[PDB]
């Protein structure tokens, strides 16, 4: 039964001068645990999920907050990066890579992974270069954002568990994302 004051006291030990940032995480963490705790068989149906966008100067401690949180957090946590992501199934990487990385921390537990938290770094790397809609395909940039839209709202993505043992299985495990939080 964690509380914003208790969780903030723990985070305050590792971070200083980020009072505004800490409050946002405490509420989401407290609400997220509260949301999942609820059976959902009540008047409130399809409770909303508040995402988080951490913008700050260089070296201000953004990446550190996500790292310290996982130590105190019980539910699984994963820290990916949007540098390697490529849209349209290119050679670089796909967006599903984020989900399989979560299971590595969760030991391939679907019921326990949907309640996990996700973090992404260097999100500005995919912003358009202060231009109007492009005249060609931007694999890294405007294209990547289009793919993440449905993932943040909630959907099921194919993910080979453990990468797949051999040709025998040739299946993918559906992983809901409506409850997953994104930072």
């Amino acid at each position: 039964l964690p509380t914003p004051h208790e969780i903030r006291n723990h985070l305050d030990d590792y971070v200083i001068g980020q009072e505004q940032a800490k409050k946002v995480l405490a509420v989401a963490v407290y609400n997220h645990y509260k949301r999942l705790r609820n059976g959902d068989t009540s008047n409130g149906v399809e409770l909303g999920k508040s995402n988080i966008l951490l913008i700050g100067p260089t070296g201000s401690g953004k990446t550190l907050l996500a790292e310290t949180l996982a130590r105190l957090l019980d539910v699984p946590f994963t820290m990916a990066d949007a540098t390697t992501l490529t849209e349209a199934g290119y050679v670089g990487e796909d967006v599903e890579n984020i989900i399989q990385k979560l299971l590595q921390k969760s030991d391939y537990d679907v019921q326990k992974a949907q309640r996990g938290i996700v973090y992404i770094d260097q999100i500005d790397k995919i912003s358009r270069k202060s231009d109007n809609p492009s005249i060609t395909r931007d694999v890294s940039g405007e294209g990547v954002q289009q793919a993440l839209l449905k993932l943040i709202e909630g959907t099921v993505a194919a993910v080979p568990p453990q990468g797949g043992r051999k040709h025998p299985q040739q299946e993918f495990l559906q992983v809901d994302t409506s409850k997953i939080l994104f930072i």
Binding site: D131, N132, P133, I135
Partner: protein
């Protein structure tokens, strides 16, 4: 000096000069005396617009004290040859040749500002040499005077006899009188 403006397009922002921006909208400026260089430049602009769009109206603003006849007659044939309707507007003044290009515009699309002024006279020339050579240049310039009156009557609708008497000497015509004379169609007082 010429100021630069920015035209916003879907691809991006583009820097254009004030004269080139209006050229994109089928608008040409005729300023100063009509000479071989200024005339040959307008012809290329008219031809360029013909290929881009032959069905859109062209607007030609004229503010000039006139000039060489041969340079101006090349433009007159161009306006009549091409399919688009060349709308003409008189700003400030329109001399002998400037008036000829004004009336040569498309019927019903000729305008003159309320305070504009038109002036028309006969061709000017001269020669120095033997009497045999003077007679040749005199016969040639006389044909031009006759030819310029025939075309002036065609667009203005007046009779050749009337144009001959009014063009013997300088004749200034205000903007309202130009409408009554058939040279133009209306006046663009205000925007509607």
């Amino acid at each position: 000096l010429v100021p630069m403006v920015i035209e916003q397009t879907s691809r991006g922002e583009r820097s254009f000069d004030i004269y080139s921006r209006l050229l994109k909208e089928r608008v040409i400026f005729l300023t100063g005396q009509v000479e071989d260089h200024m005339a040959n430049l307008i012809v290329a602009q008219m031809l360029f617009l013909e290929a881009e769009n032959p069905e859109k109206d062209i607007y030609l603003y004229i503010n000039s004290p006139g000039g060489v006849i041969t340079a101006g007659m090349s433009i007159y044939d161009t306006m009549q040859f091409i399919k688009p309707d060349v709308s003409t507007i008189c700003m400030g003044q329109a001399a002998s040749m400037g008036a000829f290009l004004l009336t040569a515009g498309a019927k019903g699309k000729r305008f003159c500002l309320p305070n504009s002024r038109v002036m028309i006279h006969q061709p000017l020339g001269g020669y120095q040499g033997q009497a045999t050579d003077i007679e040749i240049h005199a016969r040639e310039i006389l044909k031009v005077k006759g030819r310029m009156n025939e075309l002036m009557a065609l667009h203005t609708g007046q009779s050749l006899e009337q144009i001959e008497r009014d063009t013997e000497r300088d004749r200034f015509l205000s903007a309202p009188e130009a409408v009554e004379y058939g040279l133009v169609d209306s006046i663009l007082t205000h925007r509607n």
